[PDB]
Amino acid sequence: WVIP
Amino acid sequence: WVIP
Amino acid sequence: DSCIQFTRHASDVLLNLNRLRSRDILTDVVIVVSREQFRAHKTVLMACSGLFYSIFTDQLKCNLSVINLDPEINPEGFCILLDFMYTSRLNLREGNIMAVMATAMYLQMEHVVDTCRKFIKASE
Amino acid sequence: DSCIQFTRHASDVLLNLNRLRSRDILTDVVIVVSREQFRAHKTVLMACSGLFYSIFTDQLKCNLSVINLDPEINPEGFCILLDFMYTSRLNLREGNIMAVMATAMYLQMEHVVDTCRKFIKASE
Ligand SMILES: N#Cc1c(Cl)ncnc1Nc1ccc2c(c1)CC(=O)N2
């Protein structure tokens, strides 16, 4: 999971 | 396009 | 093999599947979550959820145009997860995390359940 | 928005759509290319090809279960492009590049046409  |  | 790969292809396919959903193009099922209804593509639901994969591979249920979810399922939680299926983006907030996690457990979406557990553990 | 994103989601969706195709699950169209037939999902075809997007948004053609391509279309070229649609991987070889490029032009798959043009220009 990432900060888009 | 890339070499996968 | 000796194939070449187009990096953005999977993301572009998903973007188009979401555009079709927004325009209600070739949607083949309505998911009913208490008073709310959500139109979708059976194949996308199956590709994202262990529960839908099970339902639409069933010889009788594969032909249904309406699927009613358990009355304990929160419509907003379902909406957030349906958006995630079509975009890879999860709108996870303090006010919805419990509903999102419970819905992801029911839908059998392991990666969502995992990030919800991690965000909860960090706040305790 | 304040969303989080699952990097591998689009790739995982596409992998599952390909698995459904391989098992002939919820495929809703057969593409006929001379003596050969290819089963697929209308939504995936539309999401990858300007030609299929046009065909399946047509009020009459959207309901067809069989689509016959132009007799000039090479079945192997079509097979290579259908595999690309479901995997992001293009099996481009000296022996098939002309057929693949002509099929991609017909199907309106601009990124494939672009790499074929580049590979051809490099060999001249
Ligand atoms: N459609 C399809 C499909 C196929 Cl073909 N093969 C394997 N899994 C498929 N989908 C599916 C099954 C289980 C789970 C998910 C998706 C996400 C998750 O957390 N569990």
Ligand SMILES: N#Cc1c(Cl)ncnc1Nc1ccc2c(c1)CC(=O)N2
């Ligand atoms: N399905 C869908 C779709 C939608 Cl909803 N919006 C916009 N394009 C869509 N698909 C589509 C249209 C034109 C082209 C491609 C795909 C690849 C390409 O080279 N040209």
Ligand SMILES: [Cl-]
């Ligand atoms: Cl029904």
Ligand SMILES: [Cl-]
């Ligand atoms: Cl997931």
Ligand SMILES: [Cl-]
């Ligand atoms: Cl027909």
Ligand SMILES: [Cl-]
């Ligand atoms: Cl393309």
